[PDB]
Symmetry: D2
C-alpha cells in the first residue's frame, strides 16, 4: 500500500546552506554594511535617530546587471542623503543556481556599501542569505502565521510585519508582540539538516502600512495605528509602504517600488527635506 509522496513528483536535494556561504563568503565590507545598517535601523526604530529608514528598490529583479546599476545610482544618494535618511536596497525575486544568483547579488551590493532588504518568505531560505540582510518584511498573508512570527523571533535583522490584506492592524501588533519572545520552530542547520531552532526574541519589529480595502497612509490611519501600538505597550514606530495597495515622529520608515529613476531622486530628495523640516 504505497502511502508516501503520492503527490510528490520530485524531491531533489538542495545544496547545503554552507555551500553558498563558502562559494560566496561575506567580505569584511559586506559584514560592516550589514552590521551598521541593522544598528542604524534600530536607532531610528526606537527614536534614538531622527532620520527616516527608506526601503526602496525594483519591484522584482529579472536582470542582475540592471540591478547592480540601480544600486550604483542608489549608493550615491544613500550617502548624499545620509544625515536625513537611511537608504536600503530592496532585492525581491534550478533553485541551486537561483540561490547562487541571489547570494552573489546581495554580497556584491553589500560589498559596494549598499545594505540590502527583502522578504522572509519561508524558514529554510533565510539560512542562505540573511547574513547579508539588514532588514526584511513579513508579507500580509504570513503575518498571523505562528511560524512566521517565530521566524522573526530569531531573525538577526529588524523585521517589518505588514498589515492584513483587508487592512487589519491587530495581526501585526500581535505579531510584533509574539516576535519579542523566545520561540521554537523547525528548519535546517547551515549543513542542511532538519533541526530545532530556539530563538531569543526580536525587539526590533514594527508594522508596515501597505493598504487593504482602501489605503491607510492617512494621518488618521497613522493616528489610529499609533494609538493602537501605544495601547498594546509598544513603541509607536510605523513604516508606510507607498506601493502595492496603498512633525510626526511616529513615522520611522517608508517603502518605495522604483525601477530604472527621475522620480526616485525627486521622492528621496523630497522626504529628505521633510525629515530636515521635522527636526525644527
Amino acid at each position: 500500500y504505497q502511502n508516501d509522496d503520492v503527490r510528490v513528483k520530485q524531491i531533489k536535494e538542495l545544496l547545503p546552506p554552507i555551500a553558498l556561504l563558502e562559494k560566496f563568503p561575506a567580505t569584511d565590507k559586506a559584514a560592516f554594511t550589514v552590521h551598521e545598517a541593522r544598528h542604524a535601523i534600530h536607532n531610528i526604530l526606537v527614536g534614538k535617530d531622527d532620520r527616516l529608514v527608506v526601503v526602496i528598490g525594483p519591484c522584482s529583479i529579472h536582470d542582475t546587471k540592471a540591478a547592480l546599476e540601480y544600486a550604483e545610482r542608489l549608493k550615491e544618494i544613500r550617502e548624499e542623503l545620509k544625515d536625513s535618511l537611511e537608504i536600503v536596497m530592496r532585492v525581491y525575486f534550478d533553485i541551486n543556481e537561483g540561490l547562487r544568483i541571489a547570494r552573489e547579488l546581495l554580497l556584491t551590493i553589500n560589498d559596494q556599501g549598499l545594505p540590502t532588504a527583502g522578504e522572509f518568505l519561508d524558514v529554510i531560505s533565510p539560512q542562505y542569505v540573511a547574513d547579508l540582510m539588514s532588514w526584511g518584511a513579513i508579507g500580509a498573508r504570513t503575518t498571523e502565521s505562528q511560524i512566521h512570527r517565530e521566524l522573526a523571533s530569531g531573525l538577526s535583522c529588524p523585521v517589518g510585519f505588514k498589515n492584513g490584506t483587508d487592512g487589519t492592524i491587530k495581526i501585526a501588533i500581535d505579531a510584533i508582540n509574539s516576535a519579542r519572545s523566545a520561540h521554537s520552530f523547525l528548519s535546517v542547520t547551515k549543513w542542511g539538516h532538519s533541526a530545532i531552532v530556539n530563538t531569543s526574541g526580536n525587539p526590533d519589529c514594527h508594522i508596515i502600512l501597505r493598504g487593504g480595502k482602501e489605503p491607510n497612509y492617512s494621518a488618521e490611519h497613522v493616528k489610529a495605528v499609533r494609538e493602537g501600538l501605544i495601547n498594546a505597550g509598544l513603541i509607536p514606530s510605523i513604516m508606510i509602504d507607498f506601493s502595492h495597495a496603498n512633525g510626526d515622529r511616529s513615522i520611522t520608515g517608508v517603502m518605495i517600488e522604483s525601477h530604472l529613476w527621475d522620480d526616485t531622486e525627486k521622492v528621496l530628495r523630497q522626504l529628505s527635506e521633510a525629515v530636515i523640516a521635522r527636526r525644527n
Copy 2:
C-alpha cells in the same frame, strides 16, 4: 562582524525522518487503514459516498494511555456506524521524543483499524508521520499562506482548509483552488536534508467552517459557502467544525437532505464520552434520513 544566529539560542539537529520510520514502520494493517480511509474520504467528498467524515477526538493529548483507551472506544462506534459515518480520530498534542511519542501513537491506532487525523502546521513534520495520516486540517492563521497551500498540493491525504479567524471564506476557496495545482516548496528529505519539493496538486482539498466574529454553521452560511464554492467552479463539499468559534442544526440540515455537508469535526473527551455516543448516533440517523430524499 557577527551577523549570524545572533537571535538563535540553540540549533540542535533533529532525528532524520527515516529514523522515525525505521523505529516505527507501518504495519500492513496501518498501511491498509490509511489507504482505505483516504480513498473513502475522497468518495464521500466528491459525492460518490453518501456517508459523513466525522473527525472527532480529544482537544489535546497529554496522556498516550488515555488516548489509546479512547481509540478502542471510538473503533467500536466506527465499526457500528460504518454505513453512515467514516469516523477518523483527531490526534493533536525533546522534539525527538515528541516525534517518537507522536509516531508510535498514530501507528498503534492505525494498526488497531482506527484511521487518524491531524493539523499540518509546518512543511518539515509531515515527513515524520504523513504515511500514518488519512486526513489533515490547515489552520485559520495559515490558510492564506502560499507555503501552506503548496504543502497541501503535495500532501498524500485529503486536506481541509479552515476559514479565517474573522470568517473570510475566500482565503479557503482560493486555498482549495491553489492546492489543486502543481506547486514547489522547500522542505527536508527523509534523510533530513534541505530539498526542493515539486508537487502535483491535491484535488481532495475542501473548506472547514470553524466560525469567526459570529458562528457560521447556519443553513445560510452553508448555502453561501456552497454558492461561493459553486462560483469558483468547486464542488460544494463542506465540513463544519462544531467546536472553536462555532461553539465559542447541521444534523437537521442533513436529515432534511443537505448533501453539501460531507464532513463534521467534533472535540470529544470538549464533550465527554456519553454525549459522544449520542452525537455520533444522532448524525448517523441524520445520514440515514438524508438518503430517503
Copy 3:
C-alpha cells in the same frame, strides 16, 4: 562532456544513518552492561590483573541467525560454567547493506541482551558507528594491520582491539600497530547522523597481537617466546592471543592441546585464544572439549 567524476562508480546509494540503526535497535540495560563488563574484564586479563583467559569462539561465517542464536544459548551456559577460568565472547562474523546492518545489530542486541558478549572484526571506519556500542572486542586483519587508518580506528574504538600478524608471519607490523594505536590520532569517517566528519582520538592501550599463522604456523612455545621478547624489547606488555584457526590450523584441536600445555607449564603471556566453531571449523562436541580443556589449563597455570 569530459565526464571526470564517478566514471568507475556504477551506483552511489545513501545508506541509513547510524542513528536510524541505534533507534530501531537500541541497546538494552542488559546489553549495555555485558559490553561494559566484558570490555573491563578483557582489559584486566590483557594487563595481568585477571588470570582468566579470553576465549573468542564462534562460527566461521553467519548465514542463519536462528543457527547463531542457538549457538549463543549453548555457548552462554559454558560461559556461566567456566566463568572463573575463561572470559567467553562470541565471534559474530557475517559474510542490501541496509538490511545487513539491521540483521547484524538485532543479532548483537539479542546476544548481548541474553548476557553473551560479542566479538568481531573492523574492516572499515564507517561500519563501526552502526554496531560498535555492542562490541566488547574486535580484530584488525593481517591485510590491514600495517594500515595507519585502521591503527587510527583502533585508537578511538571503545573495545579492546586485536592486531593480526603478517600473512607471512610478520610480528613487527602489529608491535608497530599496538604502539600507534596507543596514541591520539585523527581519521575521516561519519557522525552518528551519517555525515562526513573528523574523528579525534585519545588512544587505545588495550590493543594486542593475534598470532594467526603466516607461511608456517606460529603457536609453538618458541614463537610465543620470541613474540613476547619482541613486545618486551619494544616496551609493550607481553599479552598474546593465539588463533587456533586460519593459518595456525591449515588443527584447532591439536593447537588447543599445545597451547593448553603452555598455559599448564605457566605461560602467563598467552592471555587469549581464538577458535572457529559451528554447531553442525570444529563442531559443538569439540567446542565443549576445547573450552573445558583450556579452563583446566588455566586452573593449572594458577598452581605453578
Copy 4:
C-alpha cells in the same frame, strides 16, 4: 555505562564535498587537463604510447607559493619533453576544512595552468573532495594488501599505482591489480557528505610501483622477475619505478635514473612510468631538469632498438 565514543576526544562535521566543488569549481581548462592526462597515462600503460609517465614533485607541500613556482617551471618542461614524457606533478601534503580548501585551490590552479596532478589515496572519503582533479594516484606499501583500498581503486576515475610491500613483496600488488579490475563495494560519503554505498565497475588501469623494501628493486633483474610475475598472472607487464623512498636508501635517486635510463635505451618496453621526488631550494631543480632530459633521451633511444 559509557560504551560509545569513550576513546573519541571530538567528532566534528567536515565540510560536505559539495562545498569544496562549489567554492573551487573545476575550470574547463582543469577538466581537459585531467581528462587528456588520464587518457594519455592509459595509452602508455597498455603500449599504445611509447612515452613514459613521470610522477615528479615535492616530497611535502608546506607552501602553495613554492609549489606554484615549481608548477610553472615544470609545465615548460612538460611542453618541451611532450613527445617523450607524460609529465604530471606530485601533490602530497604533510583545520582539515582549511586544508581541504588549500589542497583543492592548488590542484585547481595547477590543472587550470595545464599541469596534470598526481597524489595518493589514503582513505575512501578524502577522494570525494579533490579526485575530479587527479589524473593519477597511488596506494602505498602499507595499504596495498588492503581490500578497502583495492575497492576504492576499483572505482577511481584515474589510473592507480599499487606500491609493493615494505619487505619488497610483489604478489600483494599483482593481487591488488587483479582485484581492482573487478567490480566491488565500499562505504564512503556522497558529494553531499552522507553515508553511502559505492558500487564500482572496476579499473583496468592499475599497475605496480617498485618503491623498494629490504634492499632496492630497480635493477634489470627485479623488473625481469616482476614482469614475469605479471605475465604468469595474465596481466599487462606495465611497471613503474619509484626512484625515491626505499629504492634510494638525492644523489642515489640520480643513480637509479641512470640505471633505469640504460634499461629503457636497451628497449625495456615494460617500464612505462617512473617516480621522482623533486624540490626547488628530494633532488633540486637543476637535477630535475637533468633527469627529465635524461629519461627523455632514453625513451627516444627506446624507439630505435
